[PDB]
Design a protein around this motif. Structure first.
Motif, PDB file in Angstrom:
ATOM      1  N   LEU B 231       3.301   9.039   1.874  1.00 37.71           N
ATOM      2  CA  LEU B 231       3.461   7.661   2.339  1.00 37.71           C
ATOM      3  C   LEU B 231       2.468   6.693   1.708  1.00 37.71           C
ATOM      4  O   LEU B 231       2.830   5.577   1.327  1.00 37.71           O
ATOM      5  N   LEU B 232       1.213   7.125   1.621  1.00 38.05           N
ATOM      6  CA  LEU B 232       0.174   6.378   0.921  1.00 38.05           C
ATOM      7  C   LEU B 232       0.495   6.146  -0.546  1.00 38.05           C
ATOM      8  O   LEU B 232       0.340   5.031  -1.044  1.00 38.05           O
ATOM      9  N   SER B 263       9.162   6.336   8.856  1.00 40.41           N
ATOM     10  CA  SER B 263       7.733   6.065   8.903  1.00 40.41           C
ATOM     11  C   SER B 263       7.394   4.936   7.937  1.00 40.41           C
ATOM     12  O   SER B 263       6.663   4.015   8.299  1.00 40.41           O
ATOM     13  N   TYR B 266       8.147   1.071   8.781  1.00 34.60           N
ATOM     14  CA  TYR B 266       7.164   0.446   9.652  1.00 34.60           C
ATOM     15  C   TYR B 266       5.807   0.326   8.992  1.00 34.60           C
ATOM     16  O   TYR B 266       5.038  -0.583   9.307  1.00 34.60           O
ATOM     17  N   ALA B 267       5.512   1.244   8.081  1.00 36.62           N
ATOM     18  CA  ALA B 267       4.260   1.216   7.354  1.00 36.62           C
ATOM     19  C   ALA B 267       4.055  -0.121   6.644  1.00 36.62           C
ATOM     20  O   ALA B 267       2.937  -0.634   6.599  1.00 36.62           O
ATOM     21  N   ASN B 269       5.174  -3.068   7.485  1.00 32.30           N
ATOM     22  CA  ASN B 269       5.095  -4.221   8.374  1.00 32.30           C
ATOM     23  C   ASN B 269       3.815  -4.984   8.110  1.00 32.30           C
ATOM     24  O   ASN B 269       2.745  -4.377   7.989  1.00 32.30           O
ATOM     25  N   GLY B 270       3.933  -6.308   7.997  1.00 34.49           N
ATOM     26  CA  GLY B 270       2.791  -7.176   7.693  1.00 34.49           C
ATOM     27  C   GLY B 270       2.349  -7.177   6.240  1.00 34.49           C
ATOM     28  O   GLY B 270       1.383  -7.850   5.895  1.00 34.49           O
ATOM     29  N   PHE B 271       3.044  -6.425   5.390  1.00 35.74           N
ATOM     30  CA  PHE B 271       2.745  -6.381   3.955  1.00 35.74           C
ATOM     31  C   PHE B 271       3.803  -7.154   3.160  1.00 35.74           C
ATOM     32  O   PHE B 271       4.870  -7.440   3.699  1.00 35.74           O
ATOM     33  N   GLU B 283      17.281   6.167  12.659  1.00 40.27           N
ATOM     34  CA  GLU B 283      16.907   6.929  13.836  1.00 40.27           C
ATOM     35  C   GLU B 283      18.102   7.803  14.209  1.00 40.27           C
ATOM     36  O   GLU B 283      17.952   9.014  14.361  1.00 40.27           O
TER      37      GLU B 283
ATOM     38  N   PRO D  21      -0.531   0.141  10.072  1.00 43.30           N
ATOM     39  CA  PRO D  21      -1.485  -0.102   8.976  1.00 43.30           C
ATOM     40  C   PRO D  21      -2.045  -1.541   8.876  1.00 43.30           C
ATOM     41  O   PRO D  21      -3.266  -1.723   8.982  1.00 43.30           O
ATOM     42  N   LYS D  22      -1.185  -2.544   8.687  1.00 43.28           N
ATOM     43  CA  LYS D  22      -1.672  -3.926   8.573  1.00 43.28           C
ATOM     44  C   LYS D  22      -2.428  -4.339   9.829  1.00 43.28           C
ATOM     45  O   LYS D  22      -3.494  -4.949   9.743  1.00 43.28           O
ATOM     46  N   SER D  47       3.525   8.860  14.448  1.00 40.15           N
ATOM     47  CA  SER D  47       4.486   8.049  13.701  1.00 40.15           C
ATOM     48  C   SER D  47       4.658   8.495  12.246  1.00 40.15           C
ATOM     49  O   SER D  47       5.619   8.098  11.582  1.00 40.15           O
ATOM     50  N   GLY D  48       3.712   9.299  11.752  1.00 41.20           N
ATOM     51  CA  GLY D  48       3.652   9.678  10.338  1.00 41.20           C
ATOM     52  C   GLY D  48       2.766   8.757   9.504  1.00 41.20           C
ATOM     53  O   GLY D  48       2.497   9.044   8.334  1.00 41.20           O
ATOM     54  N   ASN D  49       2.304   7.661  10.109  1.00 36.32           N
ATOM     55  CA  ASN D  49       1.516   6.641   9.412  1.00 36.32           C
ATOM     56  C   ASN D  49       0.028   6.703   9.721  1.00 36.32           C
ATOM     57  O   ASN D  49      -0.679   5.721   9.517  1.00 36.32           O
ATOM     58  N   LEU D  51      -2.583   8.448   8.319  1.00 42.40           N
ATOM     59  CA  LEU D  51      -3.486   8.338   7.172  1.00 42.40           C
ATOM     60  C   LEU D  51      -3.540   6.924   6.635  1.00 42.40           C
ATOM     61  O   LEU D  51      -4.624   6.360   6.485  1.00 42.40           O
ATOM     62  N   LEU D  52      -2.374   6.344   6.365  1.00 43.82           N
ATOM     63  CA  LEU D  52      -2.304   4.945   5.931  1.00 43.82           C
ATOM     64  C   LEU D  52      -3.119   4.023   6.858  1.00 43.82           C
ATOM     65  O   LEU D  52      -3.945   3.236   6.386  1.00 43.82           O
ATOM     66  N   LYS D  55      -6.626   4.455   6.134  1.00 46.70           N
ATOM     67  CA  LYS D  55      -6.995   3.892   4.833  1.00 46.70           C
ATOM     68  C   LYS D  55      -7.249   2.392   4.953  1.00 46.70           C
ATOM     69  O   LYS D  55      -8.173   1.858   4.324  1.00 46.70           O
ATOM     70  N   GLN D  56      -6.437   1.721   5.768  1.00 45.34           N
ATOM     71  CA  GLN D  56      -6.606   0.290   6.016  1.00 45.34           C
ATOM     72  C   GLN D  56      -7.863   0.006   6.853  1.00 45.34           C
ATOM     73  O   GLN D  56      -8.584  -0.966   6.599  1.00 45.34           O
ATOM     74  N   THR D 128       9.449   7.437  15.255  1.00 51.25           N
ATOM     75  CA  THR D 128       9.159   6.009  15.277  1.00 51.25           C
ATOM     76  C   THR D 128       9.759   5.287  16.482  1.00 51.25           C
ATOM     77  O   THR D 128       9.633   4.064  16.583  1.00 51.25           O
ATOM     78  N   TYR D 131       7.240   3.043  18.696  1.00 50.85           N
ATOM     79  CA  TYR D 131       7.038   1.604  18.509  1.00 50.85           C
ATOM     80  C   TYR D 131       7.901   0.759  19.452  1.00 50.85           C
ATOM     81  O   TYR D 131       7.644  -0.439  19.617  1.00 50.85           O
TER      82      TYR D 131
END
Ligand SMILES: Nc1ncnc2c1ncn2[C@@H]1O[C@H](COP(=O)(O)OP(=O)(O)OP(=O)(O)O)[C@@H](O)[C@H]1O
Ligand SMILES: *C(=O)CCCC[C@@H]1SC[C@@H]2NC(=O)N[C@@H]21
Ligand SMILES: [Mn+2]
Ligand SMILES: [Mn+2]
Lengths: 86, 541, 239, 181, 79
Positions: B231-232, B263, B266-267, B269-271, B283, D21-22, D47-49, D51-52, D55-56, D128, D131
């Motif tokens: 994901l990163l 995942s 949503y990651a 979001n805000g980017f 889903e 993240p954000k 959620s799977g997020n 690490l991200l 990182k943020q 997810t 959320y």
């Protein structure tokens, strides 16, 4: 038979709210209801023993017990029909 | 194809390529996911991914696995999904001159395969060579262009470009030259296949950024989540401007598979850049595949946590569960950690090479062979003069799988092939064109009637495997249509099963009981098929 | 011009029809309810469809609109209603025609004509056949019995537009439920009364007409062996 | 308020893994600005997020993060320490720890975990839905088991809906133990 | 209520793949030259064709058409 441990139970049809199925492999420790009875929602109608652990099976609603597929000390398998209500 | 590439560049959103139908299960479930299960959510899939770039649903290991283990025709999987999903491009993974097999075939074979693949519904061909040797990709590319379909040229990633000490071969500079080369050949899209999930997050940013200003081609990034950083890597990829990425649905994602689409959505979001797709629907897909996966527990890999040691052995994610099954069948079950330790050793024994199919397969075959016989690296410096090697491992030193950038070590090689020796050219140019007319005749003889083009290259690609599929079909009919639980386990006493045959046409089978084996070991099964008493006698093995 | 055919029915008649159609090289479609999951007729057609999980066994073969839906989806040219469901239903035959589907049976006008046991009597008189002496129309308002009995004959009978009465205050007290028993089975509370002929012999005539004006009878059937309202044994020809 | 109360460290317990993240970049940047306390971030990778998000958090200037060894990580557990270590390669800030040892520890727990297979969770995947519904840790497993126990197995996509609604009926509350029960 | 071939001195040929025999190419008593394919054995996605260690005359074949063999099994002996 000599007890009822050889008895094969039908599988509960999953998309029918009348049918209650066995959730785990267990043993019927105590039967609490018989054919033709009526008790409130959440009535403790069957007591199973999963693996040294004990859970009562409860009715999802109000209604009349049409069939009880098991007797005391009977083995059960996942998805086995146990109770039918109306 | 030209236009589609142009359209991808204008798109500011991230474009998604789903791999649930191919690479997700190749990574997680030893490729065993059957057609029935795909065909059941094809309509829902058609909707959810209505905006996706493509669906990767063919090629790779699925051609072997369908005919072989699942005894179902992969051509039928293609056509049915085609008809079911007319809106989204179909993508399949093609192994340059090895097509969908494990060594190089004559050029007229690869040509014929692409002609039939394109005709039957494939739109995007991801061409890649397991030694990153562009010469090997030319033939496939020419066949794809001619079919009016999209040609995607791949570089396969290895080592670490963040680390100069890892390699002075596979550098940032290595990839830029290789990309630029793929542009002149007129590939429509550039692909980065990170087969082993080696592409560190920072590296993807640095890598995509350079390429994005080295070539005009839209960049399609593919990675595996084995490290746990998938994901990163994608988030960083997206920042550097990547055009398309390969994702899987949440319940078919992670570990050796690709990152979770869900995942990721949503990651971001805000980017600045978001993912172009339907989450509410993904889903749904995740809930579906969550249950279906359950059907394949027997095929689940050993791993259940992200593994950072993959940066050491570099086992491809799509090799992982397939070679876990090979080791298991070979007496090396449990002992798989020793199979990974020497897969690293084998790699440096060969001079630090690219490991994908089939070059990974050779390292894999060399790993399984040496670990079976307790063989080390130094057990060949003067002692190689006898050993007796797996067909793939000798085939590699003959050069039937191509030429690795750094060649081989003369003395390293000799002790393995002695008798005849190395061939220097790309196999396609000496290997004589296969006679498709004689192949037509042969199949027209064994079977006695109508045989198609699909049949022909199928048999040329897979002689024994194809023949055996025909044997099975004669015996048992079309097995695609059985639901998976029935396909793997049969039926239980008192069970009734619906088999869908056509619209409004189904088989209602009830199994009543099975008798004792009679004085021949023949048991009697009492059935009821479509309201009709029926008896079937089976040899009890 | 009938390539494919649907049977809006079940049981022996669905089977019989399927056979007739098969012999004409006409493709067939069955319908089944939930309770019918394992009824044999389901396996005798070329195709079959569940009417749906939305209505129970009761209204499964009576649901006009969802049977048409199945027929449209299957590309059906004609529907045979067999007997005793929608087989006499004007509405269903109308909807079929409205969808380019041939209703295998008489015209809309015939179904309206004979679908009512007063209209049918009007028709028979208009065609000059001896009818059972009774009310030239219906009776809805009260004292309804005490306004035909004392000016007709001895034994009488009250029938709904689909209860034997021998007079004397039982003209109403044994009639009480002829308003509501014609409400559970049928949708008509409207009623009429006929002079109950004692000791009759039930004789029916089989008639077949084409769409070109040709009509024939296939003689008579004696249906006199009956228990109450129900038919039991039939004979042909009558002896 | 907490700085003023005399706590030595500000901790953020993200029990449901809701901190995207954000949002984590945004939150921790403003929090570094507002207080003189070091920040100690805790989250769940459900959620799977995970690490991200970490990182943020690192990019926004977080002082300490909660991790777990690879083989005891991910899903409802903490983000993997081993993964993050390599994730951060090439970025301004690194993880103060020992790789070779994380791996060695991971391998240990990998085998030890097998002793407990009878107690594994049924969560196999990132989810997810969290959320929307906000169920902390493995609570959507407990409630799924409990709803089955009450014959509501088929109507669980309605238990998720009602849970989300009940939260608003109680005026939008933090759901940890025991406010989640 | 298959003997294993020796892997040190005596020059037998031991199985190095735990699978099944597909083709037996050499007879009980046969003249065989250097690197001559004598045995074709098959695993899952693997295939070892057994070569000759030196030269010699094959004195025994211990495997038929389609036999399951284990690792380090007796298949050939050559001098
Ligand atoms: N006027 C009458 N006098 C005596 N019996 C009658 C009379 N009318 C009807 N019946 C009885 O009822 C039977 C037929 O009339 P009924 O009211 O049952 O029509 P129905 O049930 O609609 O007939 P079908 O089922 O054939 O459509 C006769 O066989 C007879 O026994
Ligand atoms: C058996 O036919 C299953 C295929 C297993 C081999 C596959 S092909 C793709 C993966 N890469 C590789 O080198 N081996 C794996
Ligand atoms: Mn891949
Ligand atoms: Mn916590």
């Amino acid at each position: 038979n000599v007890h009822t441990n050889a008895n094969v139970k039908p599988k509960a049809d999953k998309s029918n709210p009348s049918h209650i199925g066995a959730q785990m492999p267990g043993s019927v420790t105590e039967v609490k209801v018989s054919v033709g009875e009526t008790v409130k929602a959440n009535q403790p109608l069957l007591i199973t023993e999963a693996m040294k652990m004990e859970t009562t099976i409860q009715a999802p609603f109000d209604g009349v017990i049409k069939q009880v597929t098991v007797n005391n000390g009977d083995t059960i398998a996942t998805g086995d029909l146990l109770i039918e209500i109306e | 194809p030209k236009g589609v590439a142009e359209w991808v560049k204008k798109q500011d959103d991230v474009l998604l390529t789903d791999t649930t139908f191919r690479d997700a299960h190749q990574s997680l479930l030893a490729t065993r996911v059957r057609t029935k299960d795909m065909i059941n959510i094809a309509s829902k899939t058609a909707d959810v991914f209505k905006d996706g770039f493509s669906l990767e649903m063919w090629g790779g290991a699925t051609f072997d696995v369908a005919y072989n283990f699942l005894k179902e025709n992969p051509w039928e999987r293609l056509e049915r999904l085609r008809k079911a999903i007319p809106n989204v491009l179909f993508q399949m993974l093609l192994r340059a001159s090895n097509a969908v097999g494990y060594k190089n075939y004559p050029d007229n074979v690869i040509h014929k395969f692409v002609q039939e693949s394109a005709k039957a519904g494939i739109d995007v061909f991801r061409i890649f060579d397991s030694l990153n040797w562009v010469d090997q990709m030319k033939v496939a590319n020419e066949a794809v262009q001619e079919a009016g379909k999209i040609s995607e040229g791949t570089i396969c990633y290895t080592g670490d470009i963040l680390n100069p000490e890892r390699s002075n071969i596979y550098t940032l500079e290595y990839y830029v030259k290789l990309a630029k080369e793929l542009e002149r050949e007129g590939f429509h899209i550039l692909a980065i296949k990170d087969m082993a999930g080696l592409l560190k997050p920072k590296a993807a940013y640095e890598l995509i950024g350079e390429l994005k200003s080295a070539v005009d081609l839209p960049i399609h990034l593919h990675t595996h989540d084995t490290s746990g950083n998938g994901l990163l890597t994608y988030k960083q990829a997206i920042d550097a401007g990547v055009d398309i990425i390969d994702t899987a649905v949440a319940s078919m994602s992670g570990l050796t598979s690709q990152p979770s689409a869900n995942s990721l959505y949503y990651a971001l979001n805000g980017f600045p850049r978001h993912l172009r797709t339907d989450i509410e629907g993904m889903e749904s897909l995740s809930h579906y595949w969550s249950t279906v996966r359950t059907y394949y527990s027997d095929f689940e890999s050993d791993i259940k946590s992200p593994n950072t040691e993959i940066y050491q052995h570099e086992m491809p994610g799509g090799q992982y569960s397939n070679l876990s099954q090979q080791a298991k069948s070979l007496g090396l079950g449990e002992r798989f950690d020793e199979v990974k330790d020497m897969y690293r050793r084998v790699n440096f024994l060969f001079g630090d090479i690219v490991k994908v199919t089939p070059s990974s397969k050779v390292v894999g075959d060399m790993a399984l062979y040496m670990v079976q016989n307790d063989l080390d690296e130094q057990s060949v410096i003067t002692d190689g003069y006898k050993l007796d090697f797996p067909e793939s491992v000798v085939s590699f030193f003959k050069g039937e799988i191509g030429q690795p950038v750094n060649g081989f070590n003369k003395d390293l090689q000799a002790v393995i092939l002695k008798g005849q020796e190395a061939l220097t050219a790309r196999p396609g140019e000496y290997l004589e064109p296969v006679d498709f007319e004689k192949v037509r005749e042969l199949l027209e003889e064994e079977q006695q009637g109508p045989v198609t083009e699909q049949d022909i290259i199928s048999y040329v690609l897979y002689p024994k495997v194809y023949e055996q599929y025909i044997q099975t079909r004669n015996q048992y009919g079309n097995l695609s249509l059985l639901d998976t639980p029935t396909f793997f386990f049969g039926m239980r006493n008192g069970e009734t099963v619906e088999i869908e045959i056509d619209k409004g046409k189904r088989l209602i089978i009830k199994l009543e009981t099975i008798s004792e084996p009679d004085e021949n070991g023949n048991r009697t099964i009492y059935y009821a098929m479509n309201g009709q008493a029926r008896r079937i006698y089976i040899k009890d093995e | 011009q009938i390539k494919k055919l649907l049977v809006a029915n079940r049981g022996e008649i669905a089977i019989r029809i399927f056979r007739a159609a098969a012999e004409l090289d006409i493709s067939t479609v069955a319908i089944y309810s939930n309770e019918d999951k394992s009824s044999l007729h389901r396996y005798k057609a070329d195709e079959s469809y569940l009417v749906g999980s939305d209505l129970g066994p009761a209204e499964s073969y009576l649901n006009i609109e969802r049977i048409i839906d199945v027929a449209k989806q299957a590309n059906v040219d004609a529907i045979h209603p067999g007997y005793g469901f929608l087989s006499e239903n004007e509405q269903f035959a109308r909807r079929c025609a409205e969808e380019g589907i041939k209703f295998i049976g008489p015209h809309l006008e015939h179904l309206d004509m004979f679908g009512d046991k007063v209209k049918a009597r009007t028709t028979a008189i208009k065609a000059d056949l001896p009818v059972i002496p009774g009310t030239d129309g219906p009776i809805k308002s009260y004292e309804l019995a005490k306004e035909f009995a004392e000016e007709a004959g001895f034994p009488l009978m009250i029938k709904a537009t689909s209860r034997i009465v021998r007079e004397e205050s039982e003209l109403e007290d044994a009639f009480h439920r002829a308003k509501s028993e014609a409400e559970k089975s049928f949708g008509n509370s409207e009623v009429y009364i006929e002079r109950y002929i004692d000791n009759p012999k039930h004789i029916e005539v089989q008639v077949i007409g084409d769409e070109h004006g040709n009509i024939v009878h296939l003689f008579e059937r004696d249906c006199s062996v009956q228990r109450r309202h129900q038919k039991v044994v039939e004979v042909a020809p009558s002896v």
